[PDB]
C-alpha cells in the first residue's frame, strides 16, 4: 500500500547549511549530482571545501558554548525536537523516498517501506534516549562523594556515505543530538539531496542555529578538512577501509579527536546442510543482492555444506535469473542501478577478474541496459578462498558460492579475513548455532536471517571493518565525554 | 579429589550469636537437633524466642547507626571482609561439609563438591559487588542537579530453610553484607549447626559486632518475632508457600517492612522427541532426585512427548532402581535420608495419594531402611494434570512422568499451575528451545541442562513461587534503599 | 500564558471501562461525585464492586495471553502508542485541566501548568523506555550461555488517590504499559471523572481492548476486590499508611501478589541560618501549602535555626495571610477547597488539637467559606516534637514551625518519625548540604528547593511512607518479572 | 606503621618475559637502569626491540586462540587469579616498595603506603568485575531475539610510564585481564624493574603462559613496534601528548587497532576567597609537589582570588621552604630526586624560562643536589596566562601562582588551554562549587581536595590530555569488543 511516486521530484535544497541558513561555497563552485537510472544531471550542488567546513565548525562551536540555548535546553526537550523532526520526515515521506530513489537508484518501494521507515524508527528511538543516559554515583574509599557526569563530547564531525543516504544521516544525528552534541556533517557527492532536504526540516523542527550544519562537497577536500580540523572533538566516518586509515592518521596528526569508523566487509553467510533450503536460498539472495549489492555487510561469501551444494546453487541461480532489473520507480523492479560510473566500472572489473581466475560463471556477467548503470545479477560458483572475488569487497550484485565439509573448517575459512563486520549462520540445530555465533569474528551474527537491523541493536566491525558501535545504547558511548567529580565530605557513610 | 570425612564431627557452636558473643536463650531453653540418618539426637541448641530476637535487633540497629564502624567502612573493605570469610570457610571446608551431612542428611561428597563450592563462589562473587553498585546522576528538567544514592535498607531479618543450610546462608549474607546492611538471621531448627559455626568465622574475619546476628529456634516463635518486629526494615524468607503468606501478612500488620520470598514449585521438565535420549534421562533423574528431592525447583513434572514415552519411562525406571540409598558418608551413596520425620511422613502420604488416584507406580513407593528417614526412589507413570501428585509440591524422591502431544498443548499444561519457580526444555532444535523458553512462566528456564546455578545469574519465582530475585546484580535490589537528591544550581548545562 | 477555562465543563464519561467499551455496574448502582467548591453533585458515576473487578481482570488476563496483539506488539510500538496518548491529552489539555479543577478543587492555573504539564512529560518519558529496558547476558561458570529476559509482571491492579488524579494515573500507566503489562485501575470516588475521560483517549490512541481497564467505585468494595483477587499479579497503591497495611495483608492473604506503596509522610523542611531568607520563606510556603496541603510529601515540619527564627516566622505569616483562598477557576486564587467533607472535618480537628496543646496559632485556624470545603491558611509556631500536629499527617493547609540550634540536633529530630517520604535543606554551605542529605532518612532530599519532580528521578518512601520507587528507570522495576534462561553449549569461550 | 626498608634490595628479574619465561633480547643487547638518588647504575636489563615484540605478540595471540585455557576459563576464575596476584604483591610488599624507590626515587614511605596500597586496591577491584560486565538482551522489532556478548578485544599492547611504574601496570593489567584479554606490555627504560618482578608473581599466581608478556626496551623501538604491529588489536599509551600523536598515527597506518591515551595536563587548582585557608594551602602544596612534581594531573596552575592572594602566597612559600628534600629511604624525606638527568635539566630549563619572562621567583630556583637529581621546591608568583611556565607541562617541583578576581573570569582562563585532565575548586559555598565543577573542561574535578583516586572512579582527559577513561566500570569499555547476535524466532512476545 505504497503511495504513487512523483517520478520527477523537484529539488529545493542544494546549498551548504550553516546556522539554519543556506549558503554557496566561498569559491562559488558547484558540482553536478546525477540520476543513475538515466545518466542525466539532476541539479548543481554547492561544492564545499576546507573554508566552508571552517565556517561550519565555528557555527557549531558557538552553539555549544556554555549558556547557549542548546546547552541549557532540558534533555527531555532534545527528545521532543527529535520526535518533531521524525513527524516532519513522516509528513514528507512520499517526497523523500522519491528523491532518494532519483538520486541513489534504489527501488522506490524500498525507499518508502524500508529506508524511510528505518529513519523514523531510528530518530524516535534516540529521542527516547535523550534524558536516560545516566552518569553514576560511586562508592569511593575515604570521606568523599564521587560521581560522574556524562557530558556531550562537543563538536562532532560526521562523514556519511552514499549507499543509505537518509538512514545513515539518521544513525549519526540520532545519538549525537540525543546527547547534546553539535554536528558538522559531510554528505556524499553521489547522494547529497535528501540530507539537504532534511536540513530544511531540522530548521522547521526548531533546532537552534549551529546545532546541525551540513557541508556537501568532495572527500579529499571537505571530508579531510573535518578529520584534520583542530576544534573538531570527534569524527565518525562510514566508508572504505582505505579511507578509514586516512581519517585515523588525520586525527592523530591534528588534535587527537576521538574516532569511530564503520568500514568494509567480506561477510560470510554459512549454510549448514540441515538448514531450511527454501528459506536459506531466499535469504542468501537477499543478503547479497539487497540495495544493488551496495551494503558493507553484504553476504558476499556464501559458504554451503557439500551435501546441499548442488541444489542450493541451482536454486540460487534460478532466483538470480528471475530478479527484475529496471526502472526503480516501477513497482515490479527489484534491482535499480549502481550509484555511479565509478562503481559501475569497478564492479565490471571484478566480474572480469572472476571469469579470469577460474570462478565458474553461472549467470549474468554483463551490462543489463543501454542507459544508466545497470548490472546483471551475477553468480559465481566453485569459488576458492585465494580468489580475488572471495577476498575483496565488490559492492555489487555479484554472488560468490563456496563449498565446505565441516564446521571446524568453515570457521577458520570464514574468519580468515581482515574484515569482520558481519556474518550469518543458517541451521536448525541449537548447538551449531551457538558454536558458530560464538566462534565467528564479526560485530553482528545473524542466525537464520540476514540484514536484520534495529535501532535497539548495536552494529559495527571487528578487525579492520571498523571500531566503535553504532545504534542501541552503545551508539551513545562515543558521543559522551565522562567527567568525574569528587567532593570532600565531613564524614562518609554507606 | 574429596578428602575423607570425620563421620561424627564435633560441635563447637550451639548458642545464640549477638554482638560477636555467644549467649544462651533468656529462657535457657534448648532443643535437640537430630541426625536424619540415624534418628538420634546430635546435641542441644539454644532455643531463641521473642526476647532473644529483640536483643538481636537492638544490636543490629546499633551497628547500623550513622557514624558507626560498619557505616563508615569503605565499600571496598566490606568486600575484603567477605573474601576473608570465604577464605575461612575454605580452610574449614572439610569440617563444614561433614557437619552439613550430619545435620541435614545429604551425601558428603555433594556437601563437599557442590554446596561448599557454591558457598565460596557466592560470597566471592558478592565481595566483588560491594563497591560497584552505582547510583545514578540524572538529567532532570530545569536548573537542578539530581542524583541517586543506593543506601542499605537497614536491619534485615533473614529466615533460612533446612534444605541448603550453608548455601542459603551465603545467598543472603552475600548481598546483604556487600551493600552495607546488618542482619538478624533465623536458622532452621532441623539444621542450625553449620550456620552457627560460620558465625564464629564471621567473628574471626573481623566484622564489627552486631552486623551479623544469628538466633536458632522455631518458626512460630523466633521467625514470627522477626517478621512482626517494628524495627526490622526488611525480611527475607525461603520456605513453603503457606508460611510465605504468614510472613507477608505479618509484614503488613506491623511496619510495612519490605518482603522477598522464595517459595515452592512444581517445575516442569519438558522432553521433546528430538532430545538426546541418554542425556535427557540422566538430567531428568538428577532434576527430580537431587538432594533427596528436597529442592524447591525440583523437576517434579517430567513431561515427555508421546513418541519417546515408553522408552523414556523404561530407562528412567532402570536408573531409579539403581540409585543407591544409604549412609551419606559412604562415597557410593547417591541418596541420603529425608531431613526429618515430618517430611518422611508427608512423603509417604503423597506416595499413597498417587496410588489411590490411579497413577501407575513403576518402582519404589515404600520405606527404604528400618532406621533413619529413608525413602525408596519412586516413579509414577501415566500421571495426569488433575492428580494431586501433579499439582502439589512433594519435596521427596518421587518422580511424576506425564505424556504430551504438541508444543502448544505442553505450554498450556506446564503453565497451568500457581507455581513458577523453574522449568526446563530438552531438544536439539533451536526454534523449540526459543519458543519454550519465552512461553514458560518460570523464573529460570534451563535448556538441555537442569539445576545449573551460578552466583552471576538471578533466581526466583513467578506467581506463588515467590517474589524478587536472589543472585546476580538482581540480588542487590532488595537490599538497597534509593534516595534521590535534587539540588538547585545557578544554571544547568548539558 | 494560560487559556481561559470552561468553568462548567460537560461530562462525557461516567461508566466502567472494560475492553474499550463502557458498562454500567452489574448492580446498576451509581454514586455521586461532588464539586468540593460548591458541595453540589456534578453527576452520577457507575459504582464498581467485586463482580465488576472480576470482569475487568478477565478482560486484562485475555489481553495478556501469549500471542495476543498486545504481547506480540513491538516494544517500540508500545512507545508510539504512549506518545499518541500524550498527543491526545495535549489536544484536550484545557478541557482536562478544567474537569480536574471541577472534581478535585485545585486551581485551574495549577491544573493546566503543573498537573497536565507533568502528565504529558511522564507519558512521553515512559514512551521512551518501552524498547530500552534490557536484560543481561551473564558470564556464568561452565559450558553454558546464560541471560535474562525482562518480561511484564502481568495483570496490574492500580489504586490511585484523589489528590493528583491525572498525574498519579500517568505515573502508574507510564511504566506499566511501557513494559507491556495490562492494567486494572481503581480510581478515587472523590475524583473519578478525569481518569474516565482519559480512558476514552486510550481507546482513540489505539490501545488493544483489555490492556487498560478502569473501575470507579469505593475502597472497601472495588479496591479490596483488586487487592485480594486471585488472578492479579501486582498491586500498586497510593494513599494512607493505614490502608497500605490493609493492602499488604490482602496480598499475603490471597496470592502473594507483588506490592508497591506510596503512603503518607511528615516531611521535615530544614532552614539553616545561612539560607537565602526570601528564597527559603517562599519555598517553605510552597512546600506546605501546595495543592491545599494535600501532598504526601508536604513540608509539614519546618525546622528553622534559632538565629533567623523570628524573622522567618514574621515573613512566613505575612505570606500565609496574603494567600488568596477562593474559586479555583479565578486566576488570582492560590488555594481552592479541600477535597471533601471528611478531610475538611479532620483538618479542623487537627487545628483544634494544636490550639489546645499549647502551640502558638499565628494566623488563620478556622473555616474560610460557608459553601464547600475551604480552610484558612493556618500557621502554628513554637511547635514541639511531641505535639499531635508535629507527629500526625494533617493533609491540609496547616504549617508547623519548629525551632532548632545545632545540625546534630535537627537530624535526630527530623529522623525521629515512622515516616520518611521526603525532606529538604536550605543552606549555602557545601558541607552542611552534604551532611544533611546523607543523614536524613527520606526517599527524596531537596536542597534549596522543594517539590521538584521529574519523570527522570525516582520518588518513594523510607520506613512507613512506602516501599518501591516510582518514576525514573526505578519505576520500571516493580513492573518487570525477571527470567533467567541458561542453555548448555558445546564449549564456552570468553 | 611502615616496616624498615632494605635500602639495597636485590634484583632477580631483568630480562624479557614471554610465555612465563625469561629470555634475553634476540640482539643480546642490554641497557643500564639507574638509581636517580645516586646517579649510579643498579643493573643491566634486556633491551627488547621489534623482534622481541614480534615474539611476544605471537605468544599472546596463541594464548588467545579459541579453545585455549585462557579463553575457556570461567570469568569468575579470572577474578580468582587477580586476587591471588594481589595476595602475592601483598606478601612481597616491603621488597616491592623498596625496589620502586630504588629505581624511581619516590620516598619509600609513599611507595609503601600509597603506591602499593593502590596497586592492591586496583587489582582487587578489577578482580570483582571479571564476571560482572554483562552484555544485553534487546527488545528488537519483529520476530527476533537479539543480544550482545561482551568479548575481549584481543591482543592488547600496553605502554606504561616511569612516574607510577607499579600503579600504572596495575591500572592496565586490571581491566585487561578482568575482561579476558592477553597483553604485550612495554615498560619504561627508567623504571623497568618493579614490573619485571611482578611478572614473576604473575607466573606464580598461575596465569597461563602468553597471557601477560613484558618487553623492556626503548620507546622508538619496542614502543613503536607495538603501535605498528599488524596483529595487535588495541594499544593503550600513557605519556606525553607529543608521543601520543605518534601512536594514533601508527595505529591508523597499520591495522586500525583501537587506541586510548592518557597524556599531559596543566591542571588548574582554583582557590576562592571563602576557602578554608590552611586546608587549601596544604592541598595546593600537595597538588603540585606530590611525586616530585611528576604527575600528569599536577595542580600547576594555582589560581587564587585577589582578596586572599598575599596571605596564601606567604603560607605557600613557607610550606615550600619547609619541604624536606633528600634520600628517599630516610623517613624524614618528603621529596626524592627527579627520575633522570633529562627531566632534571628540562625542569631547570623551565625554571630559567620563568625567571626570564617576568614571573616573580619566591623561593627555590636551582639545584638542591647534583648527586642524584634533586631540585629545590620552587614557587613562582604573579604568573600570567601567556607565560611559558603557565602553559607548558613542567613535570617538576615548580609552583605557578596566579591571581584572579571573578568566578566568570577564572573559568575562561582555566579552560583556555589545550589540556583538560584534572581541575580543583576550593570553596565552602555550594553554588560556586556546583557552577565550577560543571563549567571546567576537565576529566576529573576535585572539590576541596586533590589527587583523590579510587579504583571505582574513572580518570582520563578532555581535549589533548587524552581519550578514553581508566578505572571504574568505564575502564572496561576499551577492553571489550561488542558482538550482536540476532536470531529468528517462531513468535516474539514481550
Ligand atoms: C531457593 C533455592 C533453593 C535451592 C538451591 C539453592 C539449589 C542449589 C543447587 C545446586 C548448587 C545444584 C547442583 O542443584 C541445586 C538445587 C537447588 O534447589 C533448590 O531448591
Ligand atoms: C505519590 C505522590 C503524590 C504527590 C505528587 C504527584 C506531587 C506532584 C507535585 C508537582 C508536580 C509539584 C510542583 O509539587 C508536587 C507535589 C506532589 O506531592 C505529592 O504528594
Ligand atoms: C595517568 C595518571 C598518572 C598519575 C597517577 C596514577 C597518580 C596517582 C596518585 C595517587 C594514588 C595520589 C595520592 O596522588 C596521585 C597523583 C597521581 O598523578 C598522576 O599523574
Ligand atoms: Na546521484
Ligand atoms: Na537435624
Ligand atoms: Na469530587
Ligand atoms: Na631508574
PDB file of C-alpha atoms in Angstrom, chain B residues 319-442:
ATOM      1  CA  UNK B 319      18.054 -45.589  36.575  1.00  0.00           C
ATOM      2  CA  UNK B 320      15.847 -45.041  39.607  1.00  0.00           C
ATOM      3  CA  UNK B 321      16.070 -48.720  40.551  1.00  0.00           C
ATOM      4  CA  UNK B 322      19.879 -48.440  40.538  1.00  0.00           C
ATOM      5  CA  UNK B 323      20.085 -45.285  42.667  1.00  0.00           C
ATOM      6  CA  UNK B 324      21.972 -46.159  45.832  1.00  0.00           C
ATOM      7  CA  UNK B 325      20.211 -45.212  49.070  1.00  0.00           C
ATOM      8  CA  UNK B 326      22.252 -45.290  52.256  1.00  0.00           C
ATOM      9  CA  UNK B 327      24.675 -43.691  54.650  1.00  0.00           C
ATOM     10  CA  UNK B 328      25.516 -40.283  53.201  1.00  0.00           C
ATOM     11  CA  UNK B 329      29.139 -40.602  54.361  1.00  0.00           C
ATOM     12  CA  UNK B 330      29.562 -43.708  52.241  1.00  0.00           C
ATOM     13  CA  UNK B 331      31.119 -42.492  48.952  1.00  0.00           C
ATOM     14  CA  UNK B 332      28.947 -44.829  46.878  1.00  0.00           C
ATOM     15  CA  UNK B 333      25.727 -43.293  48.346  1.00  0.00           C
ATOM     16  CA  UNK B 334      23.665 -41.145  45.975  1.00  0.00           C
ATOM     17  CA  UNK B 335      20.595 -40.655  48.206  1.00  0.00           C
ATOM     18  CA  UNK B 336      20.594 -39.831  51.915  1.00  0.00           C
ATOM     19  CA  UNK B 337      17.547 -39.732  54.222  1.00  0.00           C
ATOM     20  CA  UNK B 338      14.890 -37.073  54.152  1.00  0.00           C
ATOM     21  CA  UNK B 339      15.512 -34.269  56.658  1.00  0.00           C
ATOM     22  CA  UNK B 340      13.029 -35.237  59.430  1.00  0.00           C
ATOM     23  CA  UNK B 341      10.143 -37.468  60.444  1.00  0.00           C
ATOM     24  CA  UNK B 342       7.546 -34.866  59.467  1.00  0.00           C
ATOM     25  CA  UNK B 343       8.788 -34.750  55.856  1.00  0.00           C
ATOM     26  CA  UNK B 344       9.216 -38.530  55.875  1.00  0.00           C
ATOM     27  CA  UNK B 345       5.519 -38.982  56.766  1.00  0.00           C
ATOM     28  CA  UNK B 346       4.427 -36.247  54.354  1.00  0.00           C
ATOM     29  CA  UNK B 347       6.144 -38.077  51.508  1.00  0.00           C
ATOM     30  CA  UNK B 348       4.594 -41.466  52.383  1.00  0.00           C
ATOM     31  CA  UNK B 349       1.204 -39.670  52.368  1.00  0.00           C
ATOM     32  CA  UNK B 350       1.837 -38.358  48.858  1.00  0.00           C
ATOM     33  CA  UNK B 351       3.042 -41.722  47.604  1.00  0.00           C
ATOM     34  CA  UNK B 352      -0.169 -43.334  48.841  1.00  0.00           C
ATOM     35  CA  UNK B 353      -2.126 -40.413  47.393  1.00  0.00           C
ATOM     36  CA  UNK B 354      -0.669 -41.149  43.960  1.00  0.00           C
ATOM     37  CA  UNK B 355      -1.589 -44.879  44.067  1.00  0.00           C
ATOM     38  CA  UNK B 356      -5.096 -44.040  45.272  1.00  0.00           C
ATOM     39  CA  UNK B 357      -5.723 -41.639  42.382  1.00  0.00           C
ATOM     40  CA  UNK B 358      -4.655 -44.025  39.607  1.00  0.00           C
ATOM     41  CA  UNK B 359      -1.080 -43.023  38.771  1.00  0.00           C
ATOM     42  CA  UNK B 360       0.947 -46.092  37.800  1.00  0.00           C
ATOM     43  CA  UNK B 361       3.624 -46.981  40.356  1.00  0.00           C
ATOM     44  CA  UNK B 362       6.640 -48.104  38.310  1.00  0.00           C
ATOM     45  CA  UNK B 363       9.098 -48.637  41.182  1.00  0.00           C
ATOM     46  CA  UNK B 364       9.686 -47.900  44.893  1.00  0.00           C
ATOM     47  CA  UNK B 365       6.774 -46.485  46.863  1.00  0.00           C
ATOM     48  CA  UNK B 366       7.812 -47.566  50.349  1.00  0.00           C
ATOM     49  CA  UNK B 367      10.338 -47.182  53.133  1.00  0.00           C
ATOM     50  CA  UNK B 368      13.976 -47.791  52.210  1.00  0.00           C
ATOM     51  CA  UNK B 369      15.615 -48.636  55.545  1.00  0.00           C
ATOM     52  CA  UNK B 370      14.474 -49.632  59.028  1.00  0.00           C
ATOM     53  CA  UNK B 371      16.172 -46.614  60.685  1.00  0.00           C
ATOM     54  CA  UNK B 372      16.607 -43.009  59.620  1.00  0.00           C
ATOM     55  CA  UNK B 373      14.220 -41.214  57.291  1.00  0.00           C
ATOM     56  CA  UNK B 374      14.986 -43.170  54.108  1.00  0.00           C
ATOM     57  CA  UNK B 375      12.506 -43.421  51.238  1.00  0.00           C
ATOM     58  CA  UNK B 376      12.839 -45.562  48.109  1.00  0.00           C
ATOM     59  CA  UNK B 377      13.246 -43.649  44.901  1.00  0.00           C
ATOM     60  CA  UNK B 378       9.784 -43.732  43.403  1.00  0.00           C
ATOM     61  CA  UNK B 379       8.449 -43.236  39.859  1.00  0.00           C
ATOM     62  CA  UNK B 380       4.851 -42.745  38.820  1.00  0.00           C
ATOM     63  CA  UNK B 381       3.860 -43.220  35.189  1.00  0.00           C
ATOM     64  CA  UNK B 382       0.747 -42.113  33.373  1.00  0.00           C
ATOM     65  CA  UNK B 383       0.292 -39.114  35.622  1.00  0.00           C
ATOM     66  CA  UNK B 384      -2.486 -36.638  34.820  1.00  0.00           C
ATOM     67  CA  UNK B 385      -2.714 -32.885  35.345  1.00  0.00           C
ATOM     68  CA  UNK B 386      -5.753 -33.280  37.629  1.00  0.00           C
ATOM     69  CA  UNK B 387      -3.975 -35.603  40.092  1.00  0.00           C
ATOM     70  CA  UNK B 388      -2.714 -34.044  43.371  1.00  0.00           C
ATOM     71  CA  UNK B 389       0.758 -35.569  42.829  1.00  0.00           C
ATOM     72  CA  UNK B 390       0.912 -33.495  39.626  1.00  0.00           C
ATOM     73  CA  UNK B 391      -0.154 -30.309  41.476  1.00  0.00           C
ATOM     74  CA  UNK B 392       1.322 -30.279  44.997  1.00  0.00           C
ATOM     75  CA  UNK B 393       4.978 -29.981  45.888  1.00  0.00           C
ATOM     76  CA  UNK B 394       6.051 -33.368  47.350  1.00  0.00           C
ATOM     77  CA  UNK B 395       9.643 -32.492  48.251  1.00  0.00           C
ATOM     78  CA  UNK B 396      10.814 -36.105  48.210  1.00  0.00           C
ATOM     79  CA  UNK B 397      12.271 -38.751  45.890  1.00  0.00           C
ATOM     80  CA  UNK B 398       9.085 -39.116  43.825  1.00  0.00           C
ATOM     81  CA  UNK B 399       9.065 -38.704  40.086  1.00  0.00           C
ATOM     82  CA  UNK B 400       5.971 -37.911  38.046  1.00  0.00           C
ATOM     83  CA  UNK B 401       6.041 -38.701  34.331  1.00  0.00           C
ATOM     84  CA  UNK B 402       3.377 -37.147  32.142  1.00  0.00           C
ATOM     85  CA  UNK B 403       2.767 -37.656  28.424  1.00  0.00           C
ATOM     86  CA  UNK B 404       2.062 -34.948  25.804  1.00  0.00           C
ATOM     87  CA  UNK B 405       1.440 -34.415  22.107  1.00  0.00           C
ATOM     88  CA  UNK B 406       2.186 -30.871  20.900  1.00  0.00           C
ATOM     89  CA  UNK B 407       4.351 -27.986  21.931  1.00  0.00           C
ATOM     90  CA  UNK B 408       1.257 -25.737  22.217  1.00  0.00           C
ATOM     91  CA  UNK B 409      -0.539 -28.205  24.485  1.00  0.00           C
ATOM     92  CA  UNK B 410       2.503 -28.636  26.745  1.00  0.00           C
ATOM     93  CA  UNK B 411       2.959 -24.898  27.266  1.00  0.00           C
ATOM     94  CA  UNK B 412      -0.645 -24.576  28.459  1.00  0.00           C
ATOM     95  CA  UNK B 413      -0.279 -27.564  30.839  1.00  0.00           C
ATOM     96  CA  UNK B 414       3.154 -26.522  32.127  1.00  0.00           C
ATOM     97  CA  UNK B 415       1.885 -23.004  32.876  1.00  0.00           C
ATOM     98  CA  UNK B 416      -1.454 -24.100  34.415  1.00  0.00           C
ATOM     99  CA  UNK B 417      -0.064 -24.021  37.888  1.00  0.00           C
ATOM    100  CA  UNK B 418       0.055 -21.467  40.704  1.00  0.00           C
ATOM    101  CA  UNK B 419       3.802 -22.214  40.935  1.00  0.00           C
ATOM    102  CA  UNK B 420       6.518 -20.857  38.619  1.00  0.00           C
ATOM    103  CA  UNK B 421       9.995 -21.280  40.021  1.00  0.00           C
ATOM    104  CA  UNK B 422      11.712 -23.052  37.185  1.00  0.00           C
ATOM    105  CA  UNK B 423      11.379 -25.127  34.048  1.00  0.00           C
ATOM    106  CA  UNK B 424      13.467 -26.952  31.530  1.00  0.00           C
ATOM    107  CA  UNK B 425      13.426 -27.924  27.913  1.00  0.00           C
ATOM    108  CA  UNK B 426      15.311 -30.748  26.245  1.00  0.00           C
ATOM    109  CA  UNK B 427      15.586 -30.500  22.498  1.00  0.00           C
ATOM    110  CA  UNK B 428      18.245 -30.203  19.774  1.00  0.00           C
ATOM    111  CA  UNK B 429      16.007 -27.820  17.823  1.00  0.00           C
ATOM    112  CA  UNK B 430      16.814 -24.109  18.027  1.00  0.00           C
ATOM    113  CA  UNK B 431      13.207 -22.938  17.368  1.00  0.00           C
ATOM    114  CA  UNK B 432      11.647 -25.209  20.020  1.00  0.00           C
ATOM    115  CA  UNK B 433      14.211 -24.081  22.602  1.00  0.00           C
ATOM    116  CA  UNK B 434      13.499 -20.408  21.935  1.00  0.00           C
ATOM    117  CA  UNK B 435       9.687 -20.768  21.721  1.00  0.00           C
ATOM    118  CA  UNK B 436       9.515 -22.720  25.025  1.00  0.00           C
ATOM    119  CA  UNK B 437      11.920 -20.561  26.979  1.00  0.00           C
ATOM    120  CA  UNK B 438       9.870 -17.500  26.051  1.00  0.00           C
ATOM    121  CA  UNK B 439       6.450 -19.152  26.764  1.00  0.00           C
ATOM    122  CA  UNK B 440       7.085 -20.928  30.076  1.00  0.00           C
ATOM    123  CA  UNK B 441       6.012 -18.862  33.086  1.00  0.00           C
ATOM    124  CA  UNK B 442       9.093 -19.561  35.187  1.00  0.00           C
TER     125      UNK B 442
END
